């Protein structure tokens, strides 16, 4: 790949000092950052290279650009196979008849639990070709929005199809498997066990074996539990044993909804964080999704364990979640020194990206505390890069522009009205820009997106295979009639 | 401009009384008015019913790869681009690490807010007529570029007639105002100073009203504001009540905006802001109250009983350190109780959240606080930025919805990229993943002003460069910022 100097822009590093450099530069050799700082300081690193390396150095003039570390979306679900349902493409254009459903109104816990237990049967119904075409397009949308490292916390897709998608696209991916072995059946006053814990844990072991073979360093894996509602004691302890043995991170959704604690006490006899604590899962390895509905003891367990919270303040309103303001626990735990990162959660059609989530945190944390300094723009960036990489246990290699780390970075144009005269283009980016304003995406020194276009992939072809795969999956497996699907596909703007 | 236009095939959001949405809908316009709106095939019947002369010169715009919205009505805005080259804007270090809670943050520094607002008159006088017009036209262009077709001044650091001229040149609609402060809180004196004759402040608004009446385009109205209830004597409040009754006008102010406001109002004026307004007879259907979140039960009941209007800016509270959404939850609660609530951008000295960003904010933030994805539907957020804002501005006679007899003010947004694919609700995708810059076409009174994201009736490079020269002149001569601090920033501008 050789050496490149990216010079002249404002450079955000998201290093320990959250360093920003006006007229900064980044020097990369092959897959790694070697120098980053003021342009003159970096130019000295250039004149210190082996003369052979310096001979083929490529200069990128970024003087009309902002440079960011690649986004690390550590809490994501591939759900594009469900695009053609009454959460997506089949809805009437009018939203007036919409109802509080699913996650809304505190959470319909029976429906959420029953829904999650059905994923295994639908993943099974999917062809490898459908899986790969849907995964590839879904993951392209993440990449297009500046996500260079993506974290699977449970997808309706085939794990090895998602690994193949990451490999073809050139991005980094923490692969997972679906884990559900319990359901909250309304005809019972105790959890119904739905699967052998050993089978669920064997699926993840098989994925871990396959990713171990990968030589690129771009593929890792992390076991998840779908949701603590759908987790037996045997699955929780099996997960604790598996992450200790293989030295892995661990992720689940816990304290996510108002109605969760009550359903957890009724069906399992104990709240989410306490059941994880009893299995030994509340430690530095834990990424807890949402994690807002925590009492005093559960908050103290997370803080003592130096656990990690992934927060999705961009997504809550449209799902009817209340995981920011109803408790205010996640901002309080961040203030008390808990690691808190920003993530986009699940989407069956494109929803808020990392850029949109960064804006949401900036506006929403600061409004609740009447304090424009609680989340600075650089904090929002750190929360979407270095701090997310830490929660994913990938901060050895990604999440900041420092010497020795991977050359994963974004260029954003700053030459329009939105940015004019602002010495803080990241602030203009949070006010008035988002995912589609990502211009260039580089992963380990390779240009994957440029001018907001795929460089080595045909996004028109990725789209057409996705639509073909989605048609097959939607008509066959979801039994949606062709009369509802084919008209919508016919009016897709080619 | 004159002539007939059929905009057909896109998804059309009307923001009419039913919040109607038409997939493969159409808008037929003749001269400056909407004549028909609905399903393509039904509008095509209205086309076949036109005078053959009119039909002959019809221009058909294929909008099949677009979303059609009403023009955004930003009814609560301040022109502050003259202050771009201060420590709120261009002179800040790139690093944010040393930023402090200031001004409206931490519940509000009421003395500094009051003192700052009372200095506007002096700084406006320090501005050349050319600087005023150049900064106004660039500031107002930034609004228009993001889809704002009707803009409401609620008190600006600019010359009113410069802003009227800017609106006139740009082709957009403008509710002009004057700056109105006749009191300052002076902690050193244990009282408010009465800094101006209420009757002179009112006579300045009467003179603006005379000048706007001479504008023949129908695009310029005016509305008196009070800067802030801290800076308002009883005599200014009563004079405002008399003026808006005599001329049948709307009225606007900031009230119940900050945690520390109520204590400062009781100490300096005896009474909280909504109570002082109600005593002057200003809490009625004419009132647009900016922020209006720190209200007790009696104040909330006064607003409801008067059918007053609240303009909310949930896009910009966090970055200002304001807490006018969650600390009280009063504005969402008043909306649920039937008060008209609209969405606005407020003040910016450099580009900040536009209407499109504020719609997203309302959709996320109101729905999260109530654990309810239906409290603010995407079509509600649109209504709050169009029809409801028009109603609060008293311009809903002509703007805010795509209905027959209203002005042909509309936006086209392209829906053909990845963000919109397969979504029968392109407005939802727009709130998820788009913003001000994704406005493609802006039509006001049937005239295209923006197309493909570019101004077609202005020189965008001229608006920018004249704004930069004006700001240099104002910054160095009036604000006394040295050339040595200004020219390096201006030298870095990407031309
Ligand atoms: O909505 C989906 O399709 C979906 C798919 C996979 C995982 C998923 O998980 C949560 O987001 C989640 C899970 C529990 C509580 C909560 O408040 C959010 C959701
Ligand atoms: O910030 C500015 O430059 C500015 C300029 C003109 C008016 C203005 O007014 C408010 O938005 C305002 C006024 C009072 C309380 C509040 O919470 C907000 C602010
Ligand atoms: Zn999730
Ligand atoms: Zn204001």
TrEMBL record, chain A:
Amidohydrolase-related domain sequence ranges: 66-447
Residues binding Zn(2+) 7, per UniProt: 395
Protein name in UniProt: Amidohydrolase
InterPro entries: Amidohydro-rel (IPR006680), Metal-dep_hydrolase_composite (IPR011059), Metal_Hydrolase (IPR032466), MTA/SAH_deaminase (IPR050287)
Binding site for Zn(2+) 6: 296
Annotated Zn(2+) 3 binding sites: 128
Gene of this entry: natAM
Keyword set includes Endoplasmic reticulum: no
Binding annotation for Zn(2+) 5: 278
């Amino acid at each position: 790949m050789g050496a490149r100097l990216i010079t002249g822009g404002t450079v955000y590093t998201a290093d320990a000092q959250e360093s920003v450099h006006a007229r900064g530069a980044v020097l990369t050799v092959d897959d790694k950052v070697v120098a980053v700082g003021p342009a003159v300081e970096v130019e000295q690193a250039v004149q210190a290279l082996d003369p052979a390396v310096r001979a083929e150095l490529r200069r990128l003039d970024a003087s009309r650009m902002m440079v960011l570390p690649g986004f690390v979306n550590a809490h994501w679900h591939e759900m594009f196979a469900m695009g053609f349902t009454m959460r997506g493409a089949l809805r009437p254009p009018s939203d007036r008849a919409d109802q509080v459903a699913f996650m809304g109104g505190g959470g319909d816990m029976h429906q959420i639990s029953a829904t999650f237990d059905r994923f295994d049967g639908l993943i099974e119904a999917m062809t490898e070709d459908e899986a790969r075409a849907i995964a590839e397009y879904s993951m392209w949308i993440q990449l297009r929005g500046g996500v260079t490292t993506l974290g699977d916390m449970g997808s309706l897709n085939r794990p090895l199809a998602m690994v193949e998608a990451a490999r073809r696209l050139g991005m980094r991916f923490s692969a997972s498997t679906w884990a559900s072995d319990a359901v909250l059946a309304p005809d019972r006053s105790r959890f119904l066990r739905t699967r052998d814990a050993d089978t669920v844990l064997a699926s993840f072991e098989a994925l871990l074996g396959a990713v171990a073979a990968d030589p690129t360093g771009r593929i890792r894996c992390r076991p998840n539990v779908s949701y603590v509602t759908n987790m037996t004691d045997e699955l929780a302890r099996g997960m604790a044993e598996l992450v200790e043995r293989h030295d892995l991170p661990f992720a689940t959704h816990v304290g996510a909804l108002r109605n969760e604690a009550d359903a957890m006490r009724a069906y399992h006899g104990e709240t989410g964080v306490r059941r994880l604590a009893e299995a030994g899962l509340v430690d530095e390895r834990l990424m807890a999704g949402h994690s807002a509905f925590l009492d005093d003891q559960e908050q103290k367990l997370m803080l003592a364990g130096r656990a990690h919270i992934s927060h999705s303040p961009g997504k809550y309103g449209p799902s009817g979640e209340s995981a920011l303001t109803e408790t205010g626990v996640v901002p309080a735990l961040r203030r008390a020194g808990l690691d808190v990162s920003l993530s986009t959660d699940a989407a069956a059609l494109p929803g808020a990206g990392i850029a949109e989530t960064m804006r949401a945190a900036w506006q929403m944390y600061n409004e609740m505390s009447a304090d424009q300094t609680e989340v600075l723009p650089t904090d929002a960036l750190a929360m979407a890069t270095r701090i997310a990489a830490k929660g994913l246990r990938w901060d050895d290699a990604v999440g900041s522009l420092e010497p020795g780390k991977q050359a994963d970075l974004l260029l954003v144009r700053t030459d329009d009205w939105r940015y004019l005269l602002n010495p803080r283009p990241l602030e203009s980016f949070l006010w008035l820009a988002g995912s589609a304003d990502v211009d260039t995406v580089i992963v380990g020194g390779r240009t994957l997106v440029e001018g907001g276009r795929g460089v080595e992939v045909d996004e028109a072809a990725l789209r057409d295979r996705y639509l073909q795969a989605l048609r097959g999956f939607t008509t066959r497996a979801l039994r949606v009639p062709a009369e509802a699907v084919d008209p919508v596909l016919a009016e897709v703007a080619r």
